[PDB]
Amino acid sequence: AGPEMVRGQVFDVGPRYTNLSYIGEGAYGMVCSAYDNVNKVRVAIKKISPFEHQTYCQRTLREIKILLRFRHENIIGINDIIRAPTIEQMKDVYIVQDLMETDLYKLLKTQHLSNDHICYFLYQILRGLKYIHSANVLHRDLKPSNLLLNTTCDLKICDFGLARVRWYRAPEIMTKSIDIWSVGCILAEMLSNRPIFPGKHYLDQLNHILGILGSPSQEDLNCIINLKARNYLLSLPHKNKVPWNRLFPNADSKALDLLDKMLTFNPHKRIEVEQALAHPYLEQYYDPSDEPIAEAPFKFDMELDDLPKEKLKELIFEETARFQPGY
> Is residue 97 a contact point for ligand 4VJ (CB under 6 A)?
yes
CA 245 to chain centre: 28
Distance of closest approach, residue 100 Cβ to ligand 4VJ, in angstroms: 4
> Is residue 108 a contact point for ligand 4VJ (CB under 6 A)?
no
Q: Is the link from the previous residue into 237 a cis peptide, with omega within 30 of 0?
A: no
Distance of closest approach, residue 77 Cβ to ligand 4VJ, in angstroms: 10
Q: Which of 9, 10, 12, 26 binds ligand 4VJ (CB under 6 A)?
A: 26
Residue 24, marked binder:
yes
Q: Which of 36, 92, 141, 159 is labelled catalytic?
A: 141
Query: Rounded CA gap, 274 and 240, in Å?
Result: 31
HSE-CB for 185 with a 13 A CA cutoff? 27
Distance of closest approach, residue 17 Cβ to ligand 4VJ, in angstroms: 13
> Is residue 103 a contact point for ligand 4VJ (CB under 6 A)?
yes
> Is residue 102 a contact point for ligand 4VJ (CB under 6 A)?
yes
DSSP structural state of residue 78? -
CA 203-204-208 angle, 5° bins: 120
Query: Rounded CA gap, 146 and 73, in Å?
Result: 15
Beta carbon nearer to ligand 4VJ, 142 or 212: 142
Residue type, 326: G
Q: Which residue is nearest to ligand 4VJ (CB)?
A: 26
Residue type, 258: L
> Is residue 93 a contact point for ligand 4VJ (CB under 6 A)?
no
> Is residue 158 a contact point for ligand 4VJ (CB under 6 A)?
yes
Beta carbon nearer to ligand 4VJ, 173 or 229: 173
Query: Rounded CA gap, 292 and 134, in Å?
Result: 9
Distance of closest approach, residue 143 Cβ to ligand 4VJ, in angstroms: 9
Q: Which of 82, 96, 99, 183 binds ligand 4VJ (CB under 6 A)?
A: 99
User: Is residue 90 exposed (0-12), middle (13-18) or buried (19+ Cβ within 10 Å)?
Assistant: middle
Which residue, 139, 147, 212, is CA-closest to 169?
139
Q: For the chain, how many helices (H) and strands (E)? A: 11, 10
Size of the site for ligand 4VJ (CB under 6 A): 25
Question: Is 141 a known active-site residue?
Answer: yes
Query: Rounded CA gap, 322 and 73, in Å?
Result: 23
Q: From the annotation, which residues make up the binding site?
A: 23-31, 46
What amino acid positions are annotated as catalytic residues? 141
Q: From the annotation, which residues make up the binding site for ATP?
A: 23-31, 46
**Which residues are near ligand 4VJ by CB under 6 A?**
23-31, 44, 46, 48, 76, 97, 99-100, 102-103, 106, 145-146, 148, 158-159, 161
